[PDB]
């Protein structure tokens, strides 16, 4: 499992935009920025759609007011599902990133097996990333949602 | 791999949360089952699935009792996709870990898009017996569409 102080693996995350499908090198996309990245087990699922992602939508402005250049959600879903999920959630201020084959998630050691529900998915977590180095890392406990929410990240940014 | 004339494997498909066993779901019925590589993808959302929604009543008129769609997605995405598509007449089935698809030998590796997804195909299943199996060639869409399946049922209405 990745830990605070490590650089992100040289992995790719996909996004569907106007020019079309783009494969972002993570170490390029997050270079030189303060990034809040949070992961959900799957788009259109209850906790992610009713609590986790909405929490970051409502606090997006206050997060960026404390120096956050980029807020991004990642899930083990394809980019077409991620785009439709963000439009249904009005997540225009959140960068919706797809880890279709769970390769980025596997490289972080943060995968989990949902068996017949959805195969391999991401654990629920949230990170603060400064120029590619993981500065803070909040990984949820199984079946728990208390440390990866936007309010907890908001308090972490206030610290120093 | 499944072949024309065999029964289906004793697998389950999920719907929103019941785990339909396919040997019991399709028993005593003439079933049209078609598979897509993924919910919310362009071909599946703009051509394949809408083709069966439109021709649904015509298919039922030609003797099919049940029209089902299956994809390697979880049931929450499949339900959200069916509602966005207005597919109340279609039974949207989820094979979230590709177990049903791999049992048929019809899985394909989409790599980073991605993960294991289903090949595009269409089946006519008459009391558990796959009597027509139209598996597309790579990147092809000309044997699994609703019109082809409707055509394969016409000879049942001419008693030679």
Numbering used by the authors:
A (entry chain B): 1 to 160
B (entry chain A): 1 to 16, 21 to 164
Can you quote the paper on this entry?
V. vulnificus Prx3 (VvPrx3) belongs to the 1-Cys class of Prxs, with one conserved catalytic cysteine (Cys48), and has been shown to be involved in pathogenicity in a mouse model.
To examine the interactions between VvPrx3 and peroxides, the H2O2-bound Prx3 (C48D/C73S) structure was determined at 1.9 Å resolution. The H2O2 binding site is fully accessible from the solvent since it is exposed to the external medium.
